Design a protein around this nucleic acid. Structure first.
Lengths: 182, 195, 47, 49
RNA sequence: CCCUCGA
DNA sequence: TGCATCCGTGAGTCGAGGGT
DNA sequence: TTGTGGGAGCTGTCACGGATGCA
């Protein structure tokens, strides 16, 4: 009697839609929200229409389904990021947000300097011998794993590690401008 | 008319019906009829037919089928162009575009759920109409009926608004823009200067 | 880098096939970002 | 899940769809927003026989 | 975007 | 079918700092 | 998911052109 149940639905529940929408408008105050909530109520009501006892007042039953889906909507929105929609995001807002972000609103000058040499660092690296500079560059500038650093310089792991630790020492000596930055 | 005579025709509601009509549409036939009407006719029928021909003759050049006027897939703008930023207070500010796309998504998914549940045709039709209306808002809000509103009964600016006015991209960001190496200050006379 | 000598700029209607040829995946979920981790939810508008 | 019309071409005056199908925009409004059906096809041979 | 102000 | 009505279009520039 | 159950605003704008629709 499944199609009989859905026909009973189209006979009984559908003429209640106007009053149910009036109530949804009362409790949402936004017509698009009320339409969304009424269609949600209809999904939740047609899903379990067998569970309604034929004969009693289905107005109150559907109204309770409406109020319960509204309550669940409020509880779910309380668990979402609270969003306020704006016509335009303000420059003050972009900057305020940039104040707590992992990367700021960077300027063209910052980018330019970052793409230009860091003279104190470049000279220190150029002071090292070739093998040591290459080992430290591959190791803790590009971050390769030590076996890969070996395979690029075709020397065993131990001697790449030797070159690495000793080039780190030599650069630690060469960089007295760590105190300027540390 | 469907209970009897049902296997003799197809009828339907909505954009799917409009899409079928465009499918069965013979552009050469209608273009020829309109050319005939404008050549051998006179009066306001001539003028209305010239109006109607401006569309068909244009759709009659290098493909460009009118099927593009009905959509089965909506494109979603890259998310950088619709930012979401955290505010002092733990609250967020989102561009309206995200609320519009979110209503489209919600209604499309609810329509999927109804189609799966084999809901009454009246309810599924309600959901299809709501989906149409939410895409209408996304594209050009307020153009038909009420505009989707945010708090303070403020109509959400759609994709059409982003382009129009002295605030749209054309007048606000392409024909003029903020520049670097520029300053501003009060002026004083300084009569000792040269021209 | 674009040499900025474009001959012409042309519109037409997009087909649903064009709209899918642009897309990198369907946005299936309405959720934006986690209220806790501030990270973009999968299949959402910021996925 | 269901096709949708572009509001630029339905409601943008003059309705380009209206000019395209020779339909009144009033009737297109009835159709697109589920107020009235339209006959998309008819089997004239079967109707005749 | 809005509010109050400035030329 | 000939208009009347209804609708949709447009309505100055740049600044400051405080807000949803 | 069961006696009952329709929003908060709003107009205090103006000129013009053309589709829309109506008798």
């Amino acid at each position: 009697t499944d199609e009989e149940l859905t026909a009973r639905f189209e006979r009984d529940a559908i003429p209640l839609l106007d009053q149910l929408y009036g109530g949804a408008l009362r409790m949402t105050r936004n017509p698009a929200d009320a339409e969304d909530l009424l269609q949600e109520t209809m999904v939740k009501a047609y899903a379990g229409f067998r569970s309604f006892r034929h004969g009693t007042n289905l107005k109150a039953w559907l109204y309770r389904i409406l109020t319960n889906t509204y309550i669940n909507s409020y509880r779910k929105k309380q668990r979402q990021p609270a969003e306020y929609p704006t016509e335009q995001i303000t420059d003050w807002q972009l900057a305020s947000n940039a104040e707590h972000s992992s990367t700021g609103l960077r300027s063209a000058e910052v980018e330019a300097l970052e793409a230009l040499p860091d003279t104190e660092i470049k000279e220190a690296l150029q002071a090292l011998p070739e093998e040591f500079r290459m080992a430290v560059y591959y190791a803790d500038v590009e971050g390769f794993p030590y076996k890969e650093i070996a395979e690029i310089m075709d020397t065993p792991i131990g001697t790449v590690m030797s070159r690495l630790h000793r080039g780190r020492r030599q650069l630690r000596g060469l960089l007295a401008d760590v105190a300027r930055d540390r | 008319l469907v209970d009897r005579y049902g296997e003799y025709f197809t009828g339907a509601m909505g954009a799917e019906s409009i899409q079928k009509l465009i499918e069965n549409f013979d552009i050469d036939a209608e273009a020829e009829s309109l050319r005939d009407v404008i050549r051998n006719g006179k009066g306001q029928k001539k003028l209305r037919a010239l109006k109607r021909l401006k569309v068909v003759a244009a759709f009659q050049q290098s493909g460009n089928s009118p099927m593009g006027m009905v959509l089965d897939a909506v494109p979603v703008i890259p998310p950088e162009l619709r930012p979401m930023v955290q505010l002092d207070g733990g609250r967020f500010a989102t561009s309206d575009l995200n609320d519009l796309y979110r209503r489209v998504i919600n209604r499309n998914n609810r329509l999927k759920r109804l189609i799966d549940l084999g809901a009454p045709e009246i309810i599924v039709n309600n959901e299809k109409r709501m989906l149409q209306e939410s895409v209408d808002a996304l594209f050009d809000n307020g153009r038909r009926g009420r505009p989707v509103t945010g708090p303070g009964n403020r109509p959400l600016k759609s994709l059409s608004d982003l382009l129009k006015g002295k605030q749209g991209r054309f007048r606000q960001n392409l024909l003029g823009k903020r520049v670097d190496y520029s300053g501003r200050s009060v002026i004083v006379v300084g009569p000792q200067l040269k021209l | 880098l674009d040499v900025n000598f474009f001959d012409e700029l042309r519109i037409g209607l997009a087909t649903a096939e064009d709209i899918r040829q642009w897309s990198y995946g369907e946005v299936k979920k309405p959720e934006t970002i986690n209220y806790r981790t501030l990270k973009p939810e999968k299949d959402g508008l910021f996925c | 899940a269901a096709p949708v019309t572009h509001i630029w071409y339905f409601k943008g005056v003059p309705s380009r769809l209206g000019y395209l199908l020779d339909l009144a925009p009033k009737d297109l409004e009835k159709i697109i927003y589920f107020a009235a059906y339209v006959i998309t096809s008819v089997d004239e041979e079967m109707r005749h026989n």
